[PDB]
Amino acid sequence: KIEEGKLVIWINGDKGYNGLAEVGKKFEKDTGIKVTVEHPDKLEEKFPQVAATGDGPDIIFWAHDRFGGYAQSGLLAEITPDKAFQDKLYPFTWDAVRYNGKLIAYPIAVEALSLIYNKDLLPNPPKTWEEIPALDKELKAKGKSALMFNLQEPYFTWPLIAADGGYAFKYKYDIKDVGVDNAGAKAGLTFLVDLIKNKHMNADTDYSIAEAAFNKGETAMTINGPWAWSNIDTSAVNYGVTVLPTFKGQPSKPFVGVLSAGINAASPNKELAKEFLENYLLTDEGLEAVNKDKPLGAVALKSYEEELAKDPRIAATMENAQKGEIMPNIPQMSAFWYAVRTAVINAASGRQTVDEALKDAQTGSELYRQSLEIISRYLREQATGAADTAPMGASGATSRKALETLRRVGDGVQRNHETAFQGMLRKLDIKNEDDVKSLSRVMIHVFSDGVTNWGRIVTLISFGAFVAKHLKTINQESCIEPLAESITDVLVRTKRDWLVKQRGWDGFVEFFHV
Ligand SMILES: Cc1c(-c2c(-c3ccc(F)o3)sc3ncnc(O[C@H](Cc4ccccc4OCc4ccnn4CC(F)(F)F)C(=O)O)c23)ccc(OCCN2CCN(C)CC2)c1Cl
Ligand SMILES: OC[C@H]1O[C@H](O[C@H]2[C@H](O)[C@@H](O)[C@@H](O)O[C@@H]2CO)[C@H](O)[C@@H](O)[C@@H]1O
Structure with missing residues (x-):
């Protein structure tokens, strides 16, 4: 879907987007390639939805915290500047845009309140x-x-x-x-x-x-x-x-955030975007043009940070940064923030007490890891015949009882619904790791296309288990963990608020309690 021969850029509406558009003009001047800068609302929510379908901007600007999510879903190109370019920015800024050992964005500026x-x-x-x-x-x-x-x-x-x-x-x-x-x-x-x-x-x-x-x-x-x-x-x-x-x-x-610029994996203009960012934006003159529209903070580029470092408002920004912490970039940052946003709003308005708001926030922030834990263990033990010996960890009582609940309820679903499970398994033709990725997209959609309750949730997971058994049968055991991540991912993304409202996996335990 993305148009070749041009650059579309997304950046937040509180940043220097007219300044960026002047750097845009200058790139056009030299190359004949038009550059369009846009600042749509909720661009950090919109980027992943549209990029998934191969749409969206060639370049997205946001603080670095969001970008691990984006990379994990395959939405970003790995950027590979050479050493001479890397050496022009502060190593800690490169660290903020490193995910799974790969660089996934160009750092621009460090921001603290x-x-x-x-x-x-x-x-x-x-x-x-x-x-x-x-x-x-x-x-x-x-x-x-x-x-x-x-x-x-x-x-x-x-x-x-x-x-x-x-x-x-x-x-x-x-x-x-x-x-x-x-x-x-x-x-x-x-x-x-x-x-x-x-x-x-x-x-x-x-x-x-x-x-x-x-x-x-x-x-x-x-x-x-x-x-x-x-x-x-x-x-x-x-x-x-x-x-x-x-x-x-x-x-x-x-x-602390590092404003960062990533390139869409679906972009047909990657060399153009790389050239723009490295050789027009991340220069003394490129960053100046943006900074004069809206100040960037402490910029990643050493040469220009030296001029700006003299300004006491920057010194104060770095002092607040030093007392704070660099945001993680892990995929769960988005859920953390969504949970804490809700907790602060509700506490502040009186809809919940502080204790209730932050309890819900905690459940929401743990939801992904906890669901994966349970789901992954179920699929693996189903496939191999043996449970995972390792400790459940934090919230281990919940995880352990959810797993025991699921053993009872999920085995019952697999046994009673063998026919249809065999049927749909046989229809789909799971032979390789490629066909498993296909499977997800189907489950993804069959789950999403329906109502919300624990039986449908158990059903998704139990079918996962059924497929897991198969995958072991045909020596594709490596594909079970990705199946579990995929099932977990549909579950916690599409059903987040309902899950929190049920007290997460304690509610699953209670609902099926004998
Ligand atoms: C696995 C499957 C899903 C399904 C998925 C799928 C298909 C493929 C693929 F990758 O992913 S993901 C998914 N996530 C949530 N639900 C699903 O199914 C249930 C309905 C259901 C189905 C089979 C067993 C129990 C089922 O419900 C039991 C239920 C619901 C509520 N409470 N309880 C009771 C309990 F609490 F105790 F659980 C739902 O949507 O409500 C699914 C949907 C439909 C299915 O068969 C349709 C029949 N064709 C079989 C093949 N033939 C050639 C044509 C006919 C089959 Cl097998
Ligand atoms: O409010 C949660 C939000 O915090 C950060 O967003 C900041 C951003 O880093 C700044 O550049 C500036 O634009 O203000 C935003 C706050 O409104 C996180 O980066 C973001 O992912 C998170 O949702």
Whole structure:
């Protein structure tokens, strides 16, 4: 579907997209190739849906956290710049776009949130979150407020949640160990909800409202990234960019992003995109053009980062970055974020308590790994006749009981529905690893095309088991794990909210309990 002889680029609407379009023009000048820059809404959700069908842009810009998902689904070209080009960027930026040992995007700029304050209202900004309520009472007596920032996107609230011990995935990354509902995270989120309760903040505040309030001098502080600074310059607010406040004596820990540019695997213009990015964008003049539209942060390109490093707003961005953590790029980042977005919104609005919101968030963040664990073990033990000896790990009680439940219910389905299982198995002609990939697409669609309950879920998994037995029979045992990942993937993507609403696999256990 993608058109040859041209470049289509997607980038978020808070970045310097007119600036990018000028770098575009310059590429056209030399090559005769038109460059179109677009900034559609929800482009990070839209890219994977459209790229899957071989559609979408040639180039997508986003922070690096999303790109492992994209690579895992096969949606990105492996980029292989030569050593001379690699040496022009900071190795840590290349690290942020490395997935399964392969480079999967070009890094552009490092982004962290800072505290932005209005110096005419607050000559000295607060060192602690704890002093903010009193500061707010003080500012409200003069018709102003202390702080406003986007409470609709968990990226802005995370530095506080993480300050006293909240984490996504532990310290490689242990995907088994999630810290979304530990006491640290509870305390950070509770402090936020109290802010709202006591009228220091409003749960409906979003990007635009916080931006408008700060940029007209109604609120003394916001929380935002470098991209925001241009609009504040335009507004004549006398602002500073500084270190985020501490919570319970500990630094606020923002999740640091590396703005990154990946090339669509379905693109017929890969040499053009590589040439654009390496030799027009990632140059002193290319990045300047973008930075002057909307500041990029600390750019990946060493030569231009040296000029920008002198700016104290960059120094403050790097100081907040140093106290935070580089985002993981693992495929589960998307589910983590979706879960935490929901938890913050619901806690803030009062729809759930902090305990309920973060419990649900934890379940959602663990859902993939846990489902895979159960599903994978079932298919393998069914195929070989023997259980996996290794420990279940964290949430092991749930996993173990789900597996025992599934053994009872799934064996019953296979036994009672042998005929049809044999029938559809026999129809499909599973002989190789290629034919197994085919199978998924069918299961993918047969599952998705129907209602939602545990019987249909058991049925999907049991058929998986039935196929697994076959695959061992014909010495294709290597294909069982990919079958399990595939089944798990349809299950947790299409059924996420229903699964969370059931208390995940504890609900499966209860529903089929004798
Ligand atoms: C495996 C299969 C699926 C199926 C998939 C498939 C096909 C291929 C492929 F890759 O993937 S993925 C998938 N995911 C969820 N469901 C599926 O099926 C059920 C219906 C069902 C079917 C067979 C057994 C039990 C079935 O339900 C039992 C059920 C549902 C609710 N509660 N309980 C009771 C319980 F709680 F106890 F489970 C559903 O959609 O509701 C499926 C769908 C239909 C099937 O046979 C149709 C009959 N042709 C057989 C072949 N012949 C040549 C033509 C006729 C067959 Cl075999
Ligand atoms: O809100 C969760 C969101 O956080 C990050 O998105 C940031 C992005 O990194 C920044 O470049 C800037 O545009 O603001 C976004 C927040 O609205 C993650 O990168 C993203 O994947 C996640 O959903």
